[PDB]
Amino acid sequence: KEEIQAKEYLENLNKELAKRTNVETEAAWAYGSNITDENEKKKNEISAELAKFMKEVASDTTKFQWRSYQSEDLKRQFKALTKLGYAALPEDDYAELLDTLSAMESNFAKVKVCDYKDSTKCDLALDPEIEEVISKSRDHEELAYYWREFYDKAGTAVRSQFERYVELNTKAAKLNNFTSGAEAWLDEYEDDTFEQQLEDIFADIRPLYQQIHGYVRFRLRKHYGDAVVSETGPIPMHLLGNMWAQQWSEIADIVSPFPEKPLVDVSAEMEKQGYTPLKMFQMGDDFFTSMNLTKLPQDFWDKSIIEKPTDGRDLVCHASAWDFYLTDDVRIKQCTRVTQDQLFTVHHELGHIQYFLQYQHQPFVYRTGANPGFHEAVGDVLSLSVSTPKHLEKIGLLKDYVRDDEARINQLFLTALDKIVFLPFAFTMDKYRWSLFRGEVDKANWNCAFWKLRDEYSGIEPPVVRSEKDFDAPAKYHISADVEYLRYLVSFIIQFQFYKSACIKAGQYDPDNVELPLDNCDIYGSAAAGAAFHNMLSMGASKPWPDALEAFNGERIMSGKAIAEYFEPLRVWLEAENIKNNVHIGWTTSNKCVS
Ligand SMILES: *[C@@H]1O[C@H](CO)[C@@H](O[C@@H]2O[C@H](CO)[C@@H](O[C@@H]3O[C@H](CO[C@H]4O[C@H](CO)[C@@H](O)[C@H](O)[C@@H]4O)[C@@H](O)[C@H](O[C@H]4O[C@H](CO[C@@H]5O[C@H](CO)[C@@H](O)[C@H](O)[C@@H]5O)[C@@H](O)[C@H](O)[C@@H]4O)[C@@H]3O)[C@H](O)[C@H]2NC(C)=O)[C@H](O)[C@H]1NC(C)=O
Numbered sequence: 385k386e387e388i389q390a391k392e393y394l395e396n397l398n399k400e401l402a403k404r405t406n407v408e409t410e411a412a413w414a415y416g417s418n419i420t421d422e423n424e425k426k427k428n429e430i431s432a433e434l435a436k437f438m439k440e441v442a443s444d445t446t447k448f449q450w451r452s453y454q455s456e457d458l459k460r461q462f463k464a465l466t467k468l469g470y471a472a473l474p475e476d477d478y479a480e481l482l483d484t485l486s487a488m489e490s491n492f493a494k495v496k497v498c499d500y501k502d503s504t505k506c507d508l509a510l511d512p513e514i515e516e517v518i519s520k521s522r523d524h525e526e527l528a529y530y531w532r533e534f535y536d537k538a539g540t541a542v543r544s545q546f547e548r549y550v551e552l553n554t555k556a557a558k559l560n561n562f563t564s565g566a567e568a569w570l571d572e573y574e575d576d577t578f579e580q581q582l583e584d585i586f587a588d589i590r591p592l593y594q595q596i597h598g599y600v601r602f603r604l605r606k607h608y609g610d611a612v613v614s615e616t617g618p619i620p621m622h623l624l625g626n627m628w629a630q631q632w633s634e635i636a637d638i639v640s641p642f643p644e645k646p647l648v649d650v651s652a653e654m655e656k657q658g659y660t661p662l663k664m665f666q667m668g669d670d671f672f673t674s675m676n677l678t679k680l681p682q683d684f685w686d687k688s689i690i691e692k693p694t695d696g697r698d699l700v701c702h703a704s705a706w707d708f709y710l711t712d713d714v715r716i717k718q719c720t721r722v723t724q725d726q727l728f729t730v731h732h733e734l735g736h737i738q739y740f741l742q743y744q745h746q747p748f749v750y751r752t753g754a755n756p757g758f759h760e761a762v763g764d765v766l767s768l769s770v771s772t773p774k775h776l777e778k779i780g781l782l783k784d785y786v787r788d789d790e791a792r793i794n795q796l797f798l799t800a801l802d803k804i805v806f807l808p809f810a811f812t813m814d815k816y817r818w819s820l821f822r823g824e825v826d827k828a829n830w831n832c833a834f835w836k837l838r839d840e841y842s843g844i845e846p847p848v849v850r851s852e853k854d855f856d857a858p859a860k861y862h863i864s865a866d867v868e869y870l871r872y873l874v875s876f877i878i879q880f881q882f883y884k885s886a887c888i889k890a891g892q893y894d895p896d897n898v899e900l901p902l903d904n905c906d907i908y909g910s911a912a913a914g915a916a917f918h919n920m921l922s923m924g925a926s927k928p929w930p931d932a933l934e935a936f937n938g939e940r941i942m943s944g945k946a947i948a949e950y951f952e953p954l955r956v957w958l959e960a961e962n963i964k965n966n967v968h969i970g971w972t973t974s975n976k977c978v979s
């Protein structure tokens with residue numbers, strides 16, 4: 385009979401937590417939109433106040449015999465409340481951690497480098513100045529300059545802060561009785577075999593990655609020459625069109641299977657048609673509403689930041705989506721540019737927004753993703769259909785396109801340069817941090833431990849020799865900003881499970897029909913695919929994630945079958961092409977990190 389009282393306790397507590405988290409989120413928004421010493425102080429002081437309340441909440445849960453309850457729902461809510469995270473730390477330790485975290489994120493956001501050609505102009509930021517060069521320049525010495533300048537300033541400058549962060553993250557995890565921060569993060573997936581599952585899936589897809597890597601290296605040798613790219617060594621990462629070599633789509637024009645056949649790049653047509661950031665977001669909104677999903681509320685349009693501010697202010701430009709835990713107060717902060725890549729980013733971020741809107745009726749503790757990978761997958765499912773020649777022709781961004789066998793391979797390869805290449809990258813981000821959290825790497829070996837993983841899994845390496853005098857991991861946003869990365873590995877796998885099922889539901893994919901291939905499916909306008917999204921997303925975290933997956937397509941298991949199915953036509957072509965051209969596969973151990 386205690387359950388009746390507990391039910392009323394939770395109902396009230398959830399609403400209180402939403403209200404208190406609203407205040408924290410507003411402060412965090414203000415700081416991210418506007419980096420100042422005063423906003424930093426405000427963000428961290430509100431966080432400390434919320435942490436103190438959570439601690440009292442965790443303490444109060446012991447007054448309830450919640451493990452004895454009949455209701456799985458009540459038990460699930462109470463269990464969520466016992467998990468404190470960083471809030472478990474002593475008052476002083478939590479304050480220090482907050483200061484360390486803001487030091488790292490603000491350092492990242494304030495990085496400025498000098499122009500390669502003009503050592504007087506020193507106001508080039510990553511977004512958009514440096515990223516523009518990395519994506520567009522084919523001058524290998526220019527690329528190497530910007531790589532070194534950025535990593536030195538975004539990575540190395542923050543080593544001592546990162547070290548204290550690891551220490552306090554570990555202390556926090558242990559106060560929650562996890563072994564380390566690795567176990568704390570993994571707890572979000574509610575499955576004690578989750579690591580092994582991902583190792584198994586990765587092993588199945590790894591051979592395809594090896595083939596893509598080999599072919600790209602072959603093509604880069606033809607472009608840059610053997611003085612710059614070896615046949616048998618790891619690929620110099622500054623040549624891959626991305627600061628972290630996480631996705632290689634930006635160099636597709638020089639590595640495309642059939643260069644005389646069409647390669648989709650709609651950036652120029654977007655500009656020609658007078659596209660704006662506003663129009664891009666309106667188009668994303670249109671896609672969701674077309675599937676009978678929820679329209680963006682007025683607060684979104686009023687309060688979002690969709691262009692980089694033109695005043696002198698510092699801010700976090702790294703695109704993000706925000707839930708304020710009231711009703712319909714959801715926002716995006718994106719330094720939007722008019723490019724194809726940015727159009728996908730718009731859809732990714734709007735996927736988060738849709739999830740927020742779908743579960744906003746749930747009790748506070750359930751107002752989050754089924755697991756962190758689910759949140760990341762939503763927007764990418766739409767991006768997959770947006771990226772198709774089918775959809776791009778509908779919106780008039782792709783003209784005079786003939787979709788023959790060769791054009792199809794180009795498009796599949798372009799997609800793989802984003803989707804397959806990313807898998808080892810994503811895995812290494814957390815394998816690295818897990819190894820630090822678990823105390824498996826001595827402090828003397830922290831930098832080369834990072835590059836060892838990037839070599840082992842991705843077969844890439846720095847453009848210049850690094851050592852333990854450098855510290856390169858925090859040069860990636862999520863590492864400086866303490867954002868778990870496994871969510872993205874999970875997302876890139878399960879988004880294909882979602883995409884395939886949504887395509888089947890939309891009547892857009894049949895494995896026995898040549899006219900309905902998975903790689904040209906467009907789910908625009910499909911209420912049937914939208915219904916599946918509604919069924920899943922409306923659950924939030926009310927049930928363990930296999931139940932959320934089951935609500936979508938009746939499946940309960942994370943599987944690499946769907947991603948492999950999507951790329952199967954590419955795998956067949958590429959294996960044969962690599963044999964035809966005697967392409968070397970695999971790589972020697974890198975010499976670019978001195979121990
Ligand atoms: C992470 O793991 C930690 C363990 O490694 C864990 O820390 C333990 O939490 C326990 C609370 O659950 C706590 O147990 C209490 O111990 C008290 C005395 O211990 C002190 O002296 C010891 C010397 O012998 C030292 O070793 C300790 O460090 C302590 O200083 C007891 O006084 C206390 O008892 C009371 O509470 C129980 C409540 O239990 C329930 O009560 C209800 C009543 O409604 C029953 O129906 C139910 O069946 C159940 O019994 C009462 O039973 C009892 O009458 C007393 O009122 C209690 O046993 C322990 O001290 C603590 N540390 C260690 C080292 O064990 C953390 O909590 C974990 N953290 C998280 C977040 O989970």
Ligand SMILES: NCCCC[C@H](N[C@@H](CCc1ccccc1)C(=O)O)C(=O)N1CCC[C@H]1C(=O)O
Pocket residue numbers: 630702703704705729732733760865867872
């Ligand atoms: N040109 C970059 C746009 C970035 C878009 C996206 N941003 C992240 C931001 C995450 C975040 C967590 C906590 C606080 C603040 C922000 C996202 O998942 O939206 C992202 O990082 N993504 C999208 C998938 C891959 C991953 C990346 O790029 O590494």
Ligand SMILES: *[C@@H]1O[C@H](CO)[C@@H](O)[C@H](O)[C@H]1NC(C)=O
Pocket residue numbers: 418420421422423695697
């Ligand atoms: C940023 O914050 C400062 C104080 O920290 C405030 O005075 C200023 O108005 C803010 N800038 C913008 C553009 O909102």
Ligand SMILES: *[C@@H]1O[C@H](CO)[C@@H](O)[C@H](O)[C@H]1NC(C)=O
Pocket residue numbers: 676911918
């Ligand atoms: C739109 O969604 C509602 C429920 O949210 C559903 O009942 C209805 O069938 C959907 N519209 C169409 C045309 O399917």
Ligand SMILES: [Zn+2]
Pocket residue numbers: 732733736759760
């Ligand atoms: Zn995301």
